Amino acid sequence: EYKVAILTVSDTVSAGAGPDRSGPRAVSVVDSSSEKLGGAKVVATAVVPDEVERIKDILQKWSDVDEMDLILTLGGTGFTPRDVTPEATKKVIERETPGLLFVMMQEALKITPFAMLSRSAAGIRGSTLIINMPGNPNAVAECMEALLPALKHALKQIK
Amino acid sequence: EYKVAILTVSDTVSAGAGPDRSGPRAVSVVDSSSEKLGGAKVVATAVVPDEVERIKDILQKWSDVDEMDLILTLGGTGFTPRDVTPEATKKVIERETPGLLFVMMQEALKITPFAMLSRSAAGIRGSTLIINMPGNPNAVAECMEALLPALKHALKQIK
Amino acid sequence: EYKVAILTVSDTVSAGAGPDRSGPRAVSVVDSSSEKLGGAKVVATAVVPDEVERIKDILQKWSDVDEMDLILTLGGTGFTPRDVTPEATKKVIERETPGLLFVMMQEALKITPFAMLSRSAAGIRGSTLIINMPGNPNAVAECMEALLPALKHALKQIK
């Protein structure tokens, strides 16, 4: 009923130099949150390198052509010079959703102060909600737990 | 002494299809916060539909021509495709006031996690402070309570 | 090992009409946080008036030409019409670092609600981290305490 897609952003994974350890975790978190999200299913994944054009193209495609309801990105959100996910994300979103970002930061900071190094963006494009999430496997579970109480209503409101 | 104006953003109310239930609440909250705000009075209200041009025009007019000290908007801050108040507001403000947004979000989240679905913007234009607030009648009371400790000094500082 | 530079923004100080009371405090906070920051030293200070061009030029110079690792600005962050530091900073940064802002706001609000009147910006330009901090002498000590747990890793990540 809600079409979720998960974008892994990683030079390493994209080059075939390493496995995606976060993608599967994210899929499985969404999957077991399905009821709480009002019926949602991961319907597509993709891997891109840490390059803004590659990130933008997918977000555009998944929003404008495939009409996903929810896109989660993983990675490319830190202080490393290659971390460009938020900049790519900011170019393509139309309506910022700063409350989602406030909640993720607030909860993540309860676990570790290193949370302050996340530079995630989030917003709506067309009728797709796009949320940047950190690249390590536990992050999606933690962010999804923080957002989950309200994310169902978020997706319903977007229509 | 401080001139407050309150803008209701709502297709329904603007079309005459329904009453403004939030406007009068906001007026009355400002009014009974007058002492705490250093002497403030709601001096004008207006209703506009959920259209960016209509919203921008009023914010411009009230800031540039009427020289309001404080403009509160109500509504148009959610995830609904018609909710365009923050996008309108972002076009017309000059200096962001992210602390006001942090406080409103932080307090609202203590009451309900659905607070994360607010996309309010806020900032200064010329010498007018503009704050987006949620469309339901209790929200202005709650946001004003969150901001009130420091809003007096905010208005003084703007001159 | 990390090159820190501290910019004081103040019409009064720049004109010679008054001393810098915050500058020396900031230098001394960085200095005595050196170990915790992985070896950092204030290597340069400058004073500029409350004018965006003056502020931008220095941030550009210190980032592009001198290659500072960390720039702290002091002052020009409130609601006063001359307070233009964040606007100047926003023009020169490339990658926002909103978690640093979230943390400073969160911690400052524990001390006083007037913290919500800070409009600080922060972000990375090239490989320089720029953080706006408030103009009063105790602020840099407080903000640095809030950021310190993670700022070492921030500077390492930027390279």
UniProtKB/Swiss-Prot annotation, chains A, B, C:
Q: What is the effect of changing S10D?
A: Reduced molybdopterin binding. Loss of adenylation activity
Source organism of the structure: Arabidopsis thaliana (Mouse-ear cress)
Impact after mutating V92G: Impaired folding. Loss of activity
Q: How does it assemble?
A: The G domain: homotrimer or homohexamer. The E domain: homodimer.
Q: Binding positions for substrate?
A: T77, G78, A108, G135, E142
Q: Where is this region: MPT adenylyltransferase?
A: 1-155
Q: What is this protein called?
A: Molybdopterin biosynthesis protein CNX1
Q: Which residues form the signal peptide?
A: none
Regarding protein family, the annotation reads:
In the N-terminal section; belongs to the MoaB/Mog family.
Q: Which residues of the full protein are shown?
A: 466 to 624 of 670
**Known outcome of mutating S118A:** No effect on activity
Task: Provide the binding site for AMP.
Answer: D20, R21, G76, G135
Q: What exactly does this protein do?
A: Catalyzes two steps in the biosynthesis of the molybdenum cofactor. In the first step, molybdopterin is adenylated. Subsequently, molybdate is inserted into adenylated molybdopterin and AMP is released.
Which effect does the record note for changing T77V?
Answer: Strongly reduced molybdopterin binding. No effect on activity
